[PDB]
Amino acid sequence: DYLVTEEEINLTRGPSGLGFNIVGGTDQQYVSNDSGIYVSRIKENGAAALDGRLQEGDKILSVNGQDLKNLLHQDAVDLFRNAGYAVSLRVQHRLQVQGSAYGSVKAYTNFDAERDALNIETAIKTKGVDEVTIVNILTNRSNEQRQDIAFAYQRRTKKELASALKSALSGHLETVILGLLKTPAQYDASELKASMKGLGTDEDSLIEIICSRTNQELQEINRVYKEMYKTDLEKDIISDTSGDFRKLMVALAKGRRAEDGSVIDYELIDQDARDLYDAGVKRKGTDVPKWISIMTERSVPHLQKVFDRYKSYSPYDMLESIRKEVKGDLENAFLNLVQCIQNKPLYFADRLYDSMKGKGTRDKVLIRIMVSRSEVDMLKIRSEFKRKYGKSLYYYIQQDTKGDYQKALLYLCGGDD
């Protein structure tokens, strides 16, 4: 949750004071748990600003050897009021890095799972439904916090929060909010199930998920999929797919890719670049199993260098080589997999653009990406999108969607660029 280093700071009271404002206490807890004392503001040109060691957000542990643990707000203030002009502080510097730093949606600081579950009830129970309030909460909260809100709402109402919103919402907005409530593994599992449900597979969605997920994510998806649907994901893929496209998807969904080692294996990088060339462009036909094993077994950093070393031997790069060697679902899968290896944020930027560029909106693609990447690499996606397409992802969502559905997507986007 937090990274912590502690520092002793000695300050000389200026006439304005020590030059900072404190918050906290047992009677005014800054968050739901900590009763500590925190620096909420550092006055410009104050004794603490000039000293430069104190930071906004630090926790005051002790003042002149007196601990500030479990004190009322007034008891903490009174310790400063009687401290004299030479004040010795012991502070705790805090860095809030957790999850990913490239995610649009972060954990809400003043989080209270009970009040949110309460306020979502109010909204469901208001006449006409306050969707805006449902959206303002659930899109501003981490996926873990949404799980807490789902737990509280069940205990208070004896109904599952998702089943309640499933009745209080409709259309595209319902799809977004219901997606946000599932865990990452549950959402991917159900999205995978929906693409294979029915004779006739949505290979587009199946490729996107299976190609873009890491070993850690696929291992979890495999566990949750079997819990939810009483069958193995690998078995459902074998049933809905065939040919070398089946081989590729089965190997990828296993999530047994080599982990990034500390040592870069330049010798293997060159051999794999030679193999990929021998199996495809250099020969008549294509040794597809050789392509599958290299591109599914080797680690992502390794394969990034393999694709560049491949350009030393082949007159075409990997993507052009795939378009010249295979067709159909197999070609689609290789092209997606290589893009995920080379630049996954750009891959999602391109799929976002394709879901909105022309007539209408491929809402199923737009929604899944905004949901499943909002806490992973959405800020990198927006950076690649802005760099390539000139306008922001915010702007394209704004032009393709409307209403509270747009607002939710704009929140999951996280802002303009």
Partner: peptide
């Protein structure tokens, strides 16, 4: 809340 100046 209650920012208190010290």
């Amino acid at each position: 809340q209650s920012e208190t100046s010290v």
